[PDB]
């Protein structure tokens, strides 16, 4: 199984970028397997 990498770009901030998405505040727990879950 050949896993391989190819360059896609520089890491840069772009002034002209699309803007979207909300900003939810969420209580979560992180278990030993690295999985996040919601908490109430």
């Amino acid at each position: 199984v050949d896993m391989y990498i190819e360059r896609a770009g520089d890491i840069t901030w772009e002034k002209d970028a699309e803007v979207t998405g909300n900003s939810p505040r969420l209580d979560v727990a992180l278990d030993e397997s690295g999985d996040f879950s919601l908490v109430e």
């Binding site: 990498i5 190819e6 896609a8 890491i11 699309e18 979207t20 998405g21 909300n22 939810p24 979560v28």
Partner: protein, 147 residues
């Protein structure tokens, strides 16, 4: 070895994720590669550090990325979706409130092969990687390592 954002591909060829090369170290999320060695041209990249709970892995040396969300400012996801050129998506993070502190999160839902894409602050510093999260719609933690 050039600094930049890279696709992680497997063999037809499929994009399984994304990573950040910086200071000669390749950074991605553990669940993307599971710790496998990576081919880079005629060269080989071997795993150096990894942690399943943080869902992070570095190749050729220790984790180098150390910037953090300031908690007030918009950030950009530098998404590299399969079959599309890298693109910047600006957003104001929400918050994962946990018992060991708060973590920035972005309510952006891109294809699974985008996992490992960097999230940037205004100076272009990588404040973490996209693709470990929860569903409320998907919300990704801004996952950062320790340098």
């Amino acid at each position: 070895t050039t600094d930049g954002v890279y696709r992680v591909m497997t063999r037809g060829s499929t994009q399984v994720g994304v990573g950040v090369m910086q200071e000669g170290v390749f950074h991605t999320m553990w669940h993307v590669t599971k710790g496998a060695a990576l081919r880079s041209g005629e060269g080989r990249l071997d795993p150096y550090w990894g942690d399943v709970k943080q869902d992070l892995v570095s190749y050729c040396g220790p984790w180098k990325l150390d910037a953090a969300w300031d908690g007030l400012s918009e950030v950009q996801l530098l998404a590299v979706p399969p079959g599309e050129r890298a693109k910047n998506i600006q957003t104001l993070p929400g918050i994962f409130k946990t018992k060991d502190g708060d973590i920035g999160a972005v309510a952006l839902d891109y294809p699974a092969g985008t996992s490992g894409s960097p999230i940037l602050d205004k100076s272009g510093r990588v404040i973490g990687l996209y693709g470990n999260g929860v569903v409320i719609s998907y919300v990704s933690a801004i996952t950062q390592g320790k340098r």
